[PDB]
Amino acid sequence: ERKVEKLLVANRGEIACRVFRTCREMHIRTVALFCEAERNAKHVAEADEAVCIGPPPAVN
Amino acid sequence: ERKVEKLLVANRGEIACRVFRTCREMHIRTVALFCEAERNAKHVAEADEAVCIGPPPAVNSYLRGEHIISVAKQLNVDAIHPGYGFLSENASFADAITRSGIEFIGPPASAISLMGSKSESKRIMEAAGVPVVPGYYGENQNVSFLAEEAKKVGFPILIKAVSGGGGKGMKIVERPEDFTFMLESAKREATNFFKDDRVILERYVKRSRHIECQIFFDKHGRGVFFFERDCSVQRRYQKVLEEAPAPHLSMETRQRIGEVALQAAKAVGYVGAGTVEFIFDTSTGEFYFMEMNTRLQVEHPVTEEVCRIKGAPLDLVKLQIKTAMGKPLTFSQEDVTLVGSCIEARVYAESPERGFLPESGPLTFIREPFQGVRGPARTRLDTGFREGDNVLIHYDPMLAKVISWGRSREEALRGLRQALGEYKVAGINTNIEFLKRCCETPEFARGGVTTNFISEHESQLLKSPVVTPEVAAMAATAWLLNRCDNWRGAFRLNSDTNATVHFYIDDHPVEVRLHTEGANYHKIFFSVWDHDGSFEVCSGPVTSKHRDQKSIVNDFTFLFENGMHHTVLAVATEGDVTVIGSFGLHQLRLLPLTDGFGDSSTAGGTSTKIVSPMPGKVSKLLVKSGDLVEKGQVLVIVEAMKMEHPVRALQDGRVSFLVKEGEVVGGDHVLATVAEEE
């Protein structure tokens, strides 16, 4: 099998925090994603690293 | 039996808090002890009363056993627990406590005295019949005697010598039926290493792994051995990481380790808690006695995670008080069962890059790992220091102990990894990076490590992450902002701002330049090691206006253009900038630029120095010729009508005298030439 130590999340919101939490118990790293601004949001304050992706519209 | 309501502690540190805690559950009083100052320490803030004992040196503090006993008598103390170190191993102190009537906690003085000398101790165990590997048999009376007992007393051949660690007489001669090379090897060893011609033969073991079983005894003839332990990992005779369940140890053996251990303790007679240490070779498959300690170890809470008595959690210190109570036990060796695995590691306030030399400094910020249960594992941290405390050079460098109990070894080891990573301290370099390096790359997850395991992998270890050019960007920025309004309200004309920081990374100065374009404090760039980029930075609340030695601890956010974002708690000072984040911890030393700013004189100072007025009559010159004079001492004192008027020259460099005391000299004479030391 293949080892996992880094977890990536696509969406934002309740699911981000839920996926992030259990991850702590499995002792796995976390990564967050956020749109323009949207950096004070909680999920990013819960992960290990966050990356900005671009303009607010869901296309972008 | 005798009632106990007052408990006395000798030593200081983690053991003080541990002994103090359980005491609360038994509902017993507490007393603390502290050296000069050392009154803000935690343990004293945990007890009921604390007493100062005297000067910092260990001779002055915690060694005046008679004074401690008199103070305890004045307090009408019920019991004393020495702990480990100081008077932990001193039979006179225990005897004096017994004469005073206080219940000493530990073995009787006779056992400590007997085990103080190695020869008489090994004599006692040899009489008892425990398999013991001795250090010597007779002497080299005859060379044929070597062949006589080579295949007799000990088939494995340990030639060595009477003393000295050179050991060239060994030659690693593990092959029996050797008779023409062993004598030649011994005779070539005698050359240039004569010492005493006596030679001792022993068994030679190829591999060594340390084992140490625990034991407990009441005073009513009843005891039970705890689970074994492993101390294979140790550097320079210092414990590093240990495991209570010796991985790869058959149950049957466990049982037997006990029967041997109980025989030895009964033979000498023993009360309280103790530990027997063995030495083991995998190839032979047998264990031979090496040493025992009649004192509670530091590794007691470790073995606890792998033993339960009557289904209940075990407390080792509890029983020792109950043993002192005179009550008899309640359980046989059976009620105790092991459950799961655990690992331990010690953190030392030393510098791994350096010669593991202790460092003393204030504790700026101390992260605390989550000490709660989650997943399939229990992780705990015990620390004898807190925020605002300072490390004392007199004491050993010892911060905290981290233990990861688990249902399986894997869970335990994995748990630690994350915890070891999480705990963070700022202010003094630690070996925490070393321990993590000891855990990741070495394939000791299998469980087989020898006593010398640390020695071979020293090349692999002693390795730390490389400071990326980005790390300098956040570190450099914090020092400015965490010192002043640099880049705050700044403004120039038809131009743009610029400010630079110099870092003395390793032995090479490092320059980082930061500047802005537009009307934006937010948009910032950087150029370090010929690497350029852009980022934005958003700070937090401004704190620590007094900017003392602790300086300012603030959180930072950095949005680099590529797209990332970071959070960094930076406690920056003039000496260094410390940044802690997902990268880890890194402290960058700022290029030092100090050199008697003012007094920087390279003048030759050839002549016409400390000239005296007309009357002259020099005398009482108190400076040696050709000795450096940087501070302005009285080079020459001349008297003019009772006018000493000392010249007090401050020109740096050695001063050369051309005059002698009592010699009348003319006006403005060259009494001495104050020249730079050449």
TrEMBL record, chain A:
For this entry, the protein name equals Methylcrotonoyl-coa carboxylase biotinylated subunitprotein-like protein
